[PDB]
Amino acid sequence: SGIIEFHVIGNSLTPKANRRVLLWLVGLQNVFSHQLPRMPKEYIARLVFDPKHKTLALIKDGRVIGGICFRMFPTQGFTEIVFCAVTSNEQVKGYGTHLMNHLKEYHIKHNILYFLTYADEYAIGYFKKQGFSKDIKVPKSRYLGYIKDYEGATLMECELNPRI
Ligand SMILES: CCC(=O)SCCNC(=O)CCNC(=O)[C@H](O)C(C)(C)COP(=O)(O)OP(=O)(O)OC[C@H]1O[C@@H](n2cnc3c(N)ncnc32)[C@H](O)[C@@H]1OP(=O)(O)O
């Protein structure tokens, strides 16, 4: 291959069926754990391997270099962004943005035009660059008890424009 690849992966029932995917999920778990050191490792493991969660993985030379773990709520009309990370040495090259753009294109194709996420204070500017806002248009009745809340984090929303 020799080039970056985007793979939407996860655990559909059991992770043993596809070893390549398993290895990538472990890779993701490790990247998320390293780049989100305040999240418990067991918690990251649990969600990455949860059948209702998918992860858009960025793979370079068979190695996970970043990912966005998410959960789609089609009937609610949004997706929850759960974890978002690029490995350290590959940061500040445009990959965090590429990832999010890819994720947006994927969701436009699935007619889900809202992302919700809880952002750490020191990550807010990243989300803002990706078009997220603190102003939430998804009604609280729609996301309360659907999305996971976090301590001291700021709820942010991206309204996707499918046009162009
Ligand atoms: C909501 C769920 C969560 O995970 S909350 C926390 C978000 N994730 C993390 O904090 C994990 C640790 N951080 C990272 O992995 C990376 O810093 C992330 C956020 C993924 C960005 O990856 P990276 O590959 O460097 O992205 P990039 O090259 O496309 O550049 C990012 C562009 O956004 C801008 N930005 C503005 N404010 C911030 C900020 N507070 N942190 C990071 N980036 C920020 C950058 O300046 C950059 O824009 P530009 O290229 O200068 O125009």
Author numbering: 2 to 165
From the paper:
To elucidate the structural basis for the ability of Gcn5L2 to discriminate among different acyl-CoA cofactors, we determined the structures of human Gcn5L2 bound to propionyl-CoA and butyryl-CoA to 2.0 and 2.1 Å resolution, respectively. Compared with the structure of human Gcn5L2 bound to acetyl-CoA, the structures reported here are very similar; the root-mean-square difference (r.m.s.d.) in Cα positions is 0.13 Å for the structure of human Gcn5L2 in complex with propionyl-CoA and 0.24 Å for its structure in complex with butyryl-CoA. To determine whether human Gcn5 can similarly use other acyl-CoAs as a cofactor, we measured Gcn5 activity in the presence of either propionyl-CoA or butyryl-CoA and histone H3 peptide. We found that human Gcn5L2 efficiently acetylates and propionylates peptides, while its butyrylating activity is nearly undetectable. Based on these relative rate measurements, Gcn5L2 is unlikely to contribute significantly to lysine butyrylation in vivo but may be capable of catalyzing lysine propionylation under physiological conditions. We have determined crystal structures that describe how Gcn5 accommodates propionyl-CoA in its active site and provide a structural mechanism that explains our biochemical data showing that human Gcn5 discriminates between different acyl-CoA molecules. To understand how Gcn5 discriminates between the different acyl-chain donors, we determined structures of the catalytic domain of human Gcn5L2 in complex with propionyl-CoA and butyryl-CoA to 2.0 and 2.1 Å resolution, respectively. These structures reveal that the active site of Gcn5 can accommodate longer acyl chains without major structural rearrangements, but that the butyryl chain would sterically clash with an incoming lysine residue.
